[PDB]
Amino acid sequence: GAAVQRPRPRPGAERVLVCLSYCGGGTAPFRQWAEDLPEDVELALICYPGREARFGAPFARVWTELRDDVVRSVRGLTGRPYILFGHSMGSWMAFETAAELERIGAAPPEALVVSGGVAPHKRMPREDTPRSDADMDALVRWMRDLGQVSPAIAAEPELLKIAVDLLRADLAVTESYRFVDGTRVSVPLRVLYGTEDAAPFADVERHWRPLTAGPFQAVELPGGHFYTPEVWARLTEWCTLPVPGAA
Ligand SMILES: [Cl-]
């Protein structure tokens, strides 16, 4: 598998927190989490192909291709206890990565933490997520309104064109995903979702619940798709907290 990024390696750690990014996203929004983590947890950031250190690799073109790239990277980590976290599309990717690790016989995560995403079988107004081949302005508007591009980047076409090409690649991958009815994990599952995001929290909580046979907890957090700056900065506290009922 491709190399996992570890901004603060911890050979002493007992467990690994593996983080998966959103559509058009890299490892950047998670790197600050390396400052806050208990020493028994190592931060491992998955970089999807085509961005950041992997800027020179071809984009994945379909969902299972991206999933299997993630699985090949995560599988070597699974000899130690690990937690799978993902945000927005990365929440669906974390769920499918957990399900595939289970299917292939790898050890399961200690917990799966899904953030900022509706349940995958309940895939949202069509106009509120633009198509991979929609007009560029529609893609930039969506990024801006979700907080995924800064004002400084949107102010400069030359930088924006890049961010947009990356988003188009990931939107095409996400459009090819279809949830398979009956897919379920057995691990503890924590759902994080923000009061001011697109879906009502009550629906996010209700529809993720059947996707695990294990312990379940849902936490309504302040703010929108990235919560509030203070909550985002502290989000690993929700990744390392045991799910009530887990071992
Ligand atoms: Cl996304």
Kindly report the three-state secondary structure assignment for every residue of the chain. Answer: CCCCECCCCCCCCCEEEEEECCCCCCCHHHHHHHHCCCCCEEEEECCCCCCHHHCCCCCCCCHHHHHHHHHHHHHCCCCCCEEEEEECHHHHHHHHHHHHHHHHCCCCCCEEEEECCCCHHHCCCHHHCCCCCCCHHHHHHHHHHHCCCCHHHHCCHHHHHHHHHHHHHHHHHHHCCCCCCCCCECCCEEEEEECCCCCCHHHHHHHHHHHECCCEEEEEECCECCECHHHHHCCCHHHHCCCCCCC
- Pairing between β-strand 216-221 and β-strand 111-115 as defined by DSSP bridges: unpaired
CA 127 vs CA 36, 89, 134, 139, 183: distances in Å:
37, 17, 10, 11, 27
Spatial contact of 114 and 208, defined as CB atoms under 8 Å apart: yes
Spatial contact of 113 and 85, defined as CB atoms under 8 Å apart: yes
CA 132 vs CA 24, 141, 159, 174: distances in Å:
11, 14, 18, 9
Cα 68 to ligand 1 centroid, rounded to whole Å? 18
What letter represents residue 223's amino acid? Answer: G
This structure was determined by X-ray
Cα 90 to ligand 1 centroid, rounded to whole Å? 7
Q: Which residues contact 61 (CB under 8 A, 6 or more apart)?
A: 172, 173, 176
Cα 92 to ligand 1 centroid, rounded to whole Å? 9
Cα 117 to ligand 1 centroid, rounded to whole Å? 8
Q: How far apart are CA 68 and CA 75, in angstroms?
A: 10
- Other CB atoms within 10 Å distance of the CB of residue 29: 18
Number of alpha carbons in the 13 Å side-chain half-sphere of residue 5:
21
Q: How far apart are CA 95 and CA 191, in angstroms?
A: 11
Q: How far apart are CA 129 and CA 42, in angstroms?
A: 33
- Other CB atoms within 10 Å distance of the CB of residue 194: 22
- Other CB atoms within 10 Å distance of the CB of residue 80: 12
Spatial contact of 70 and 92, defined as CB atoms under 8 Å apart: no
Cα 216 to ligand 1 centroid, rounded to whole Å? 23
Spatial contact of 26 and 48, defined as CB atoms under 8 Å apart: yes
233 backbone dihedrals φ, ψ, rounded to 5°: -60, -30
Number of alpha carbons in the 13 Å side-chain half-sphere of residue 81:
12
Cα 11 to ligand 1 centroid, rounded to whole Å? 32
Cα 106 to ligand 1 centroid, rounded to whole Å? 27
Spatial contact of 120 and 179, defined as CB atoms under 8 Å apart: yes
Cα 247 to ligand 1 centroid, rounded to whole Å? 31
Residue 50 CA, distance from chain mean position: 16
